[PDB]
Protein backbone atom coordinates (compact mmCIF):
# COMPACT_ATOMS: atom_id res chain seq x y z
CA UNK A 1 0.00 0.00 0.00
CA UNK A 2 1.29 3.01 -1.32
CA UNK A 3 0.78 6.27 1.05
CA UNK A 4 1.48 10.14 0.08
CA UNK A 5 3.03 11.92 2.90
CA UNK A 6 3.00 15.72 3.05
CA UNK A 7 5.75 17.18 5.82
CA UNK A 8 6.16 20.96 6.55
CA UNK A 9 9.60 21.21 7.91
CA UNK A 10 11.35 24.22 9.03
CA UNK A 11 15.08 24.36 9.76
CA UNK A 12 17.04 26.95 12.06
CA UNK A 13 20.45 28.12 11.59
CA UNK A 14 22.46 29.52 14.41
CA UNK A 15 25.28 30.57 15.08
CA UNK A 16 26.19 30.07 19.15
CA UNK A 17 29.02 31.30 20.91
CA UNK A 18 30.14 29.90 24.19
CA UNK A 19 28.44 31.82 27.40
CA UNK A 20 25.59 33.54 25.07
CA UNK A 21 23.12 30.84 25.60
CA UNK A 22 20.43 33.61 26.94
CA UNK A 23 21.60 36.02 23.95
CA UNK A 24 21.14 32.93 21.73
CA UNK A 25 17.86 32.35 23.19
CA UNK A 26 16.36 35.82 22.24
CA UNK A 27 17.66 35.75 18.56
CA UNK A 28 15.62 32.17 18.64
CA UNK A 29 12.41 33.40 19.91
CA UNK A 30 13.28 36.52 17.14
CA UNK A 31 14.31 34.17 14.40
CA UNK A 32 10.58 32.13 15.08
CA UNK A 33 8.69 35.87 15.36
CA UNK A 34 10.12 36.81 11.76
CA UNK A 35 9.20 33.52 10.29
CA UNK A 36 5.45 33.21 11.90
CA UNK A 37 5.30 36.54 9.89
CA UNK A 38 6.57 35.47 6.42
CA UNK A 39 3.90 36.21 3.69
CA UNK A 40 4.05 32.34 2.60
CA UNK A 41 4.48 30.66 5.93
CA UNK A 42 2.65 27.97 7.30
CA UNK A 43 2.76 25.74 10.20
CA UNK A 44 5.74 23.09 10.59
CA UNK A 45 5.34 19.74 11.24
CA UNK A 46 8.45 19.55 12.50
CA UNK A 47 11.47 21.98 13.48
CA UNK A 48 15.44 20.99 13.34
CA UNK A 49 18.54 23.00 15.49
CA UNK A 50 22.00 22.40 15.05
CA UNK A 51 24.67 20.64 17.26
CA UNK A 52 25.15 21.99 20.37
CA UNK A 53 22.21 25.01 18.73
CA UNK A 54 22.46 26.79 22.04
CA UNK A 55 25.79 26.13 24.03
CA UNK A 56 28.70 27.01 21.14
CA UNK A 57 30.69 23.99 19.82
CA UNK A 58 34.48 24.00 20.58
CA UNK A 59 34.65 23.16 24.43
CA UNK A 60 38.59 22.50 25.24
CA UNK A 61 38.23 21.40 28.87
CA UNK A 62 35.10 19.08 30.96
CA UNK A 63 35.52 22.19 33.62
CA UNK A 64 34.33 24.59 30.26
CA UNK A 65 31.56 22.52 29.51
CA UNK A 66 30.01 21.33 32.86
CA UNK A 67 28.73 25.06 33.46
CA UNK A 68 26.53 24.01 30.16
CA UNK A 69 25.35 20.33 30.62
CA UNK A 70 21.64 19.65 31.38
CA UNK A 71 19.63 16.30 31.91
CA UNK A 72 17.90 14.84 28.93
CA UNK A 73 14.75 16.89 30.40
CA UNK A 74 15.68 19.45 32.44
CA UNK A 75 17.26 22.90 31.12
CA UNK A 76 17.59 25.49 28.65
CA UNK A 77 17.44 23.35 25.68
CA UNK A 78 15.27 21.29 26.72
CA UNK A 79 12.94 23.87 27.70
CA UNK A 80 13.11 25.76 24.46
CA UNK A 81 12.48 22.87 22.75
CA UNK A 82 9.02 22.21 24.96
CA UNK A 83 7.74 26.02 24.33
CA UNK A 84 8.18 25.60 20.56
CA UNK A 85 6.67 22.63 19.94
CA UNK A 86 3.52 23.77 22.54
CA UNK A 87 3.46 26.80 20.58
CA UNK A 88 3.61 25.24 16.84
CA UNK A 89 1.61 21.93 18.14
CA UNK A 90 5.24 20.13 16.13
CA UNK A 91 8.40 17.98 16.87
CA UNK A 92 11.21 19.88 18.11
CA UNK A 93 14.42 18.31 18.05
CA UNK A 94 17.79 20.37 19.14
CA UNK A 95 21.34 19.22 20.09
CA UNK A 96 22.79 19.96 23.55
CA UNK A 97 25.52 18.71 25.97
CA UNK A 98 23.89 16.02 28.31
CA UNK A 99 25.05 14.71 31.57
CA UNK A 100 22.78 11.52 33.18
CA UNK A 101 22.63 10.73 36.27
CA UNK A 102 26.00 8.75 36.70
CA UNK A 103 27.69 11.92 35.34
CA UNK A 104 28.72 10.87 32.41
CA UNK A 105 29.13 13.25 29.61
CA UNK A 106 27.25 12.65 25.59
CA UNK A 107 26.83 15.02 22.55
CA UNK A 108 23.05 14.87 22.54
CA UNK A 109 20.17 15.74 20.38
CA UNK A 110 16.65 15.63 22.20
CA UNK A 111 12.88 14.96 20.78
CA UNK A 112 9.80 16.76 21.69
CA UNK A 113 6.34 16.10 20.76
CA UNK A 114 3.78 18.42 19.75
CA UNK A 115 2.35 17.69 23.22
CA UNK A 116 5.57 19.21 24.61
CA UNK A 117 7.03 15.77 25.82
CA UNK A 118 10.22 14.21 25.41
CA UNK A 119 9.71 11.20 23.30
CA UNK A 120 13.73 10.72 22.36
CA UNK A 121 17.25 11.34 23.27
CA UNK A 122 19.82 10.15 20.76
CA UNK A 123 23.57 10.38 21.88
CA UNK A 124 26.56 11.26 18.92
CA UNK A 125 27.90 8.08 17.74
CA UNK A 126 30.79 8.76 16.00
CA UNK A 127 33.05 11.17 17.88
CA UNK A 128 35.04 14.01 16.82
CA UNK A 129 37.98 15.30 18.21
CA UNK A 130 37.19 18.38 20.31
CA UNK A 131 34.74 15.73 21.65
CA UNK A 132 37.30 14.18 23.66
CA UNK A 133 38.72 17.69 25.03
CA UNK A 134 36.09 17.02 27.45
CA UNK A 135 35.69 13.14 28.04
CA UNK A 136 32.45 12.87 25.76
CA UNK A 137 31.08 9.18 25.57
CA UNK A 138 30.24 7.04 22.85
CA UNK A 139 26.25 6.20 22.19
CA UNK A 140 26.45 3.09 23.62
CA UNK A 141 23.23 1.82 21.57
CA UNK A 142 25.04 2.93 18.43
CA UNK A 143 22.88 4.54 15.30
CA UNK A 144 19.33 4.22 16.38
CA UNK A 145 15.63 4.81 14.87
CA UNK A 146 12.89 6.06 16.33
CA UNK A 147 8.80 6.13 15.13
CA UNK A 148 7.60 9.81 14.98
CA UNK A 149 3.92 10.39 14.79
CA UNK A 150 2.43 12.67 12.51
CA UNK A 151 -1.19 14.01 12.07
CA UNK A 152 -2.89 14.88 9.23
CA UNK A 153 0.16 14.36 6.75
CA UNK A 154 -1.03 11.63 5.02
CA UNK A 155 -2.99 10.08 2.10
CA UNK A 156 -4.05 7.43 -0.45
CA UNK A 157 -2.76 8.63 -4.21
CA UNK A 158 -6.85 8.72 -4.81
CA UNK A 159 -7.61 11.36 -1.94
CA UNK A 160 -7.84 14.99 -2.30
CA UNK A 161 -6.45 16.17 0.84
CA UNK A 162 -3.74 14.63 3.07
CA UNK A 163 -6.53 14.01 6.19
CA UNK A 164 -4.24 10.57 7.37
CA UNK A 165 -1.94 9.84 10.14
CA UNK A 166 1.47 8.43 9.57
CA UNK A 167 3.75 7.04 11.73
CA UNK A 168 7.70 7.37 10.04
CA UNK A 169 10.50 5.72 10.81
CA UNK A 170 13.04 7.81 11.65
CA UNK A 171 17.10 8.68 12.79
CA UNK A 172 18.98 11.11 13.81
CA UNK A 173 22.59 11.21 12.93
CA UNK A 174 24.81 14.25 14.72
CA UNK A 175 27.44 15.55 12.32
CA UNK A 176 30.90 13.45 12.55
CA UNK A 177 27.86 10.26 12.79
CA UNK A 178 28.61 10.97 8.60
CA UNK A 179 32.28 10.77 8.22
CA UNK A 180 34.21 7.12 8.84
CA UNK A 181 34.52 6.06 12.09
CA UNK A 182 37.79 8.36 13.49
CA UNK A 183 38.13 9.61 9.63
CA UNK A 184 40.41 6.11 9.87
CA UNK A 185 37.62 3.61 8.90
CA UNK A 186 37.57 3.24 4.35
CA UNK A 187 35.57 5.50 2.73
CA UNK A 188 33.57 2.98 1.47
CA UNK A 189 31.36 1.71 4.32
CA UNK A 190 29.34 4.91 4.48
CA UNK A 191 28.62 3.40 8.08
CA UNK A 192 25.63 5.86 9.18
CA UNK A 193 23.76 6.02 5.73
CA UNK A 194 24.28 2.23 5.55
CA UNK A 195 22.16 1.73 8.83
CA UNK A 196 19.66 3.86 7.39
CA UNK A 197 19.19 2.18 3.67
CA UNK A 198 19.27 -1.11 5.93
CA UNK A 199 16.84 0.13 8.85
CA UNK A 200 14.36 1.44 5.95
CA UNK A 201 14.77 5.31 7.75
CA UNK A 202 12.50 7.63 6.01
CA UNK A 203 13.14 10.46 7.55
CA UNK A 204 16.90 11.50 8.38
CA UNK A 205 17.66 14.48 10.87
CA UNK A 206 21.23 15.79 11.22
CA UNK A 207 21.94 18.17 13.59
CA UNK A 208 25.44 19.61 12.98
CA UNK A 209 28.42 21.31 13.25
CA UNK A 210 30.52 21.19 10.37
CA UNK A 211 33.41 22.82 9.54
CA UNK A 212 34.35 24.54 6.34
CA UNK A 213 37.45 23.64 4.53
CA UNK A 214 39.42 26.80 5.86
CA UNK A 215 39.58 25.81 8.69
CA UNK A 216 42.70 25.01 10.32
CA UNK A 217 42.81 21.05 11.30
CA UNK A 218 46.26 20.48 10.46
CA UNK A 219 47.79 18.64 13.83
CA UNK A 220 50.98 20.24 13.58
CA UNK A 221 50.15 23.45 12.72
CA UNK A 222 47.88 23.36 15.53
CA UNK A 223 50.74 22.38 17.91
CA UNK A 224 53.75 24.62 16.52
CA UNK A 225 52.86 28.10 17.36
CA UNK A 226 54.65 30.03 15.35
CA UNK A 227 52.74 28.08 12.51
CA UNK A 228 49.38 28.19 14.47
CA UNK A 229 49.98 31.92 15.03
CA UNK A 230 50.73 32.35 11.20
CA UNK A 231 47.13 30.31 10.32
CA UNK A 232 45.38 32.12 12.39
CA UNK A 233 46.35 35.61 10.94
CA UNK A 234 45.07 33.78 6.97
CA UNK A 235 41.56 33.47 9.18
CA UNK A 236 41.12 36.93 10.35
CA UNK A 237 41.63 38.38 7.14
CA UNK A 238 39.35 36.23 5.33
CA UNK A 239 36.35 37.65 7.96
CA UNK A 240 37.48 41.18 7.37
CA UNK A 241 37.42 41.49 3.50
CA UNK A 242 33.86 40.22 4.01
CA UNK A 243 32.98 42.87 6.48
CA UNK A 244 32.38 40.67 9.61
CA UNK A 245 33.38 40.24 13.02
CA UNK A 246 35.90 37.57 13.82
CA UNK A 247 32.71 35.07 15.29
CA UNK A 248 30.82 35.88 12.14
CA UNK A 249 27.52 36.84 11.95
CA UNK A 250 24.83 36.85 14.43
CA UNK A 251 21.45 38.44 14.86
CA UNK A 252 21.08 39.24 10.51
CA UNK A 253 18.58 36.28 10.03
CA UNK A 254 18.06 34.65 6.30
CA UNK A 255 14.65 33.90 5.70
CA UNK A 256 13.36 31.14 3.57
CA UNK A 257 10.14 30.50 4.36
CA UNK A 258 7.48 28.98 1.86
CA UNK A 259 9.07 29.34 -1.38
CA UNK A 260 10.22 26.77 -3.95
CA UNK A 261 13.76 28.25 -4.82
CA UNK A 262 15.81 24.94 -5.29
CA UNK A 263 19.59 25.14 -4.87
CA UNK A 264 21.30 24.84 -7.89
CA UNK A 265 23.54 21.60 -9.00
CA UNK A 266 26.96 22.22 -9.18
CA UNK A 267 30.55 20.18 -9.32
CA UNK A 268 33.00 20.92 -6.79
CA UNK A 269 36.25 22.62 -7.63
CA UNK A 270 39.52 24.88 -5.91
CA UNK A 271 36.38 27.64 -5.39
CA UNK A 272 33.26 26.39 -3.98
CA UNK A 273 35.09 25.87 -0.69
CA UNK A 274 36.21 29.09 -0.67
CA UNK A 275 34.38 30.86 2.29
CA UNK A 276 32.63 34.36 0.89
CA UNK A 277 28.95 34.90 0.09
CA UNK A 278 27.44 34.26 3.17
CA UNK A 279 24.61 34.18 1.63
CA UNK A 280 25.35 31.08 -0.44
CA UNK A 281 25.69 27.42 0.29
CA UNK A 282 28.67 25.62 0.58
CA UNK A 283 28.74 23.53 -2.86
CA UNK A 284 32.10 21.60 -1.60
CA UNK A 285 29.74 20.81 1.88
CA UNK A 286 27.27 20.37 0.39
CA UNK A 287 28.40 17.72 -2.57
CA UNK A 288 30.54 15.91 0.21
CA UNK A 289 27.11 15.38 2.48
CA UNK A 290 25.46 13.99 -0.69
CA UNK A 291 28.50 11.60 -1.13
CA UNK A 292 28.36 10.19 2.12
CA UNK A 293 24.84 9.15 1.13
CA UNK A 294 25.74 7.14 -1.70
CA UNK A 295 23.53 4.54 -0.57
CA UNK A 296 20.80 6.60 -1.54
CA UNK A 297 22.04 7.63 -5.02
CA UNK A 298 21.58 5.81 -8.14
CA UNK A 299 24.83 4.21 -9.40
CA UNK A 300 25.01 2.73 -12.67
CA UNK A 301 27.54 -0.01 -11.41
CA UNK A 302 25.70 -1.53 -8.97
CA UNK A 303 24.17 -3.77 -11.57
CA UNK A 304 27.46 -5.44 -12.02
CA UNK A 305 28.09 -5.73 -8.34
CA UNK A 306 24.90 -7.55 -8.20
CA UNK A 307 25.31 -10.26 -10.93
CA UNK A 308 29.00 -11.34 -10.44
CA UNK A 309 28.25 -11.00 -6.80
CA UNK A 310 31.32 -8.86 -5.62
CA UNK A 311 29.45 -8.04 -2.32
CA UNK A 312 28.28 -10.74 -0.59
CA UNK A 313 30.94 -11.52 1.27
CA UNK A 314 31.16 -7.81 2.35
CA UNK A 315 27.29 -8.09 3.26
CA UNK A 316 27.63 -11.08 5.44
CA UNK A 317 30.91 -10.15 7.14
CA UNK A 318 29.18 -6.28 7.84
CA UNK A 319 28.65 -5.91 11.36
CA UNK A 320 26.57 -3.58 12.70
CA UNK A 321 29.07 -1.23 14.55
CA UNK A 322 32.67 -1.41 14.27
CA UNK A 323 34.28 -3.70 16.34
CA UNK A 324 36.40 -1.43 19.06
CA UNK A 325 32.99 0.92 18.97
CA UNK A 326 31.21 1.53 22.59
CA UNK A 327 28.48 -0.68 21.17
CA UNK A 328 30.57 -4.09 22.17
CA UNK A 329 31.83 -2.98 25.39
CA UNK A 330 26.73 -6.93 22.72
CA UNK A 331 27.57 -9.79 19.91
CA UNK A 332 28.43 -11.08 17.86
CA UNK A 333 29.18 -15.86 12.68
CA UNK A 334 29.53 -16.56 9.16
CA UNK A 335 26.54 -17.60 7.65
CA UNK A 336 27.54 -18.81 4.80
CA UNK A 337 29.32 -22.19 6.46
CA UNK A 338 26.83 -22.53 9.12
CA UNK A 339 23.36 -24.37 9.53
CA UNK A 340 21.39 -21.40 10.68
CA UNK A 341 19.09 -20.24 8.34
CA UNK A 342 19.06 -16.80 6.56
CA UNK A 343 16.78 -14.57 8.53
CA UNK A 344 15.53 -11.20 7.32
CA UNK A 345 18.03 -9.04 9.04
CA UNK A 346 20.37 -10.24 6.98
CA UNK A 347 18.43 -9.95 3.50
CA UNK A 348 18.04 -6.45 4.53
CA UNK A 349 21.62 -5.45 5.02
CA UNK A 350 23.31 -3.64 2.10
CA UNK A 351 26.80 -3.05 1.54
CA UNK A 352 27.47 0.18 -1.30
CA UNK A 353 24.04 0.22 -1.38
CA UNK A 354 23.90 -3.25 -2.91
CA UNK A 355 22.23 -5.60 -0.83
CA UNK A 356 21.68 -9.99 -1.08
CA UNK A 357 18.72 -9.75 -2.92
CA UNK A 358 18.92 -6.93 -5.04
CA UNK A 359 21.23 -4.41 -7.16
CA UNK A 360 20.01 -1.30 -5.48
CA UNK A 361 17.76 -1.98 -2.47
CA UNK A 362 16.66 1.64 -1.43
CA UNK A 363 15.87 1.77 -5.48
CA UNK A 364 12.11 3.01 -6.03
CA UNK A 365 11.67 4.46 -2.47
CA UNK A 366 11.63 8.18 -1.02
CA UNK A 367 13.55 9.62 1.59
CA UNK A 368 13.85 12.91 3.25
CA UNK A 369 17.35 14.66 4.65
CA UNK A 370 17.22 17.88 6.82
CA UNK A 371 20.72 18.91 7.54
CA UNK A 372 21.10 22.09 10.13
CA UNK A 373 24.19 23.13 10.16
CA UNK A 374 25.82 26.24 12.32
CA UNK A 375 27.38 29.00 10.89
CA UNK A 376 30.18 31.23 12.31
CA UNK A 377 33.36 30.97 13.82
CA UNK A 378 35.17 29.74 16.88
CA UNK A 379 38.37 30.19 18.39
CA UNK A 380 39.90 31.96 15.81
CA UNK A 381 40.38 28.94 14.11
CA UNK A 382 37.52 26.95 13.35
CA UNK A 383 34.86 28.14 10.57
CA UNK A 384 31.80 25.93 10.42
CA UNK A 385 29.81 25.66 6.93
CA UNK A 386 26.45 27.02 7.28
CA UNK A 387 23.95 25.84 4.42
CA UNK A 388 21.34 24.07 6.49
CA UNK A 389 19.05 22.67 3.81
CA UNK A 390 16.39 19.89 3.01
CA UNK A 391 16.94 16.92 0.64
CA UNK A 392 14.70 14.62 -1.07
CA UNK A 393 16.30 10.59 -2.22
CA UNK A 394 13.55 9.67 -4.66
CA UNK A 395 14.80 6.24 -5.84
CA UNK A 396 14.84 7.15 -9.21
CA UNK A 397 16.56 5.33 -12.38
CA UNK A 398 27.30 7.79 -12.33
CA UNK A 399 27.66 11.34 -10.35
CA UNK A 400 28.90 10.71 -6.82
CA UNK A 401 27.46 14.99 -6.07
CA UNK A 402 25.10 17.40 -6.58
CA UNK A 403 24.47 16.34 -10.51
CA UNK A 404 23.05 12.93 -9.61
CA UNK A 405 19.60 13.45 -10.30
CA UNK A 406 18.08 10.45 -7.89
CA UNK A 407 18.45 13.54 -5.46
CA UNK A 408 16.76 16.36 -4.88
CA UNK A 409 17.75 19.82 -3.56
CA UNK A 410 14.72 21.94 -2.04
CA UNK A 411 16.70 24.32 -0.65
CA UNK A 412 19.80 25.59 1.41
CA UNK A 413 20.56 28.79 3.27
CA UNK A 414 23.69 30.17 3.45
CA UNK A 415 27.35 29.21 4.41
CA UNK A 416 27.41 32.24 7.05
CA UNK A 417 24.51 33.85 8.28
CA UNK A 418 21.90 32.72 11.34
CA UNK A 419 18.18 32.36 9.45
CA UNK A 420 15.52 29.76 8.59
CA UNK A 421 14.56 27.53 5.99
CA UNK A 422 11.17 26.10 5.55
CA UNK A 423 10.11 23.86 2.72
CA UNK A 424 6.70 21.68 2.36
CA UNK A 425 8.25 17.86 1.17
CA UNK A 426 6.32 15.82 -0.45
CA UNK A 427 7.24 11.72 -0.99
CA UNK A 428 5.86 8.42 -0.56
CA UNK A 429 6.10 5.53 1.63
CA UNK A 430 4.65 1.91 2.15
CA UNK A 431 2.07 0.70 4.91
Request: charged share 25%; net charge negative.
Amino acid sequence: TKLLVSLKVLVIQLNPQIGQVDQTIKRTWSILDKVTKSATYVKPDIILFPEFALTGYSFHARKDILPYVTKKDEGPSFELAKSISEKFQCYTIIGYPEEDDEQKLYNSALVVNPQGGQIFNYRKTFLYDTEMNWDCEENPEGFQTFPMDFSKCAKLSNEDSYNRDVTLKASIGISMDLSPYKFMAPFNHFEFSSFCVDNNVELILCPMAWLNSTSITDKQTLHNNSLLEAAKNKIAFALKEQGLPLAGSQGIYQLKIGDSQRTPRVPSDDSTSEYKDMDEPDMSNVNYWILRFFPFLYFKLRINWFKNSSLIESILGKTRMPLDHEYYKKHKIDLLDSEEVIKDTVLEKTFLGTSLGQPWKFQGKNAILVLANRCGTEDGTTIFAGSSGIYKFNGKKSSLDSLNESVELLGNLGKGLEGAILREVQFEVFR
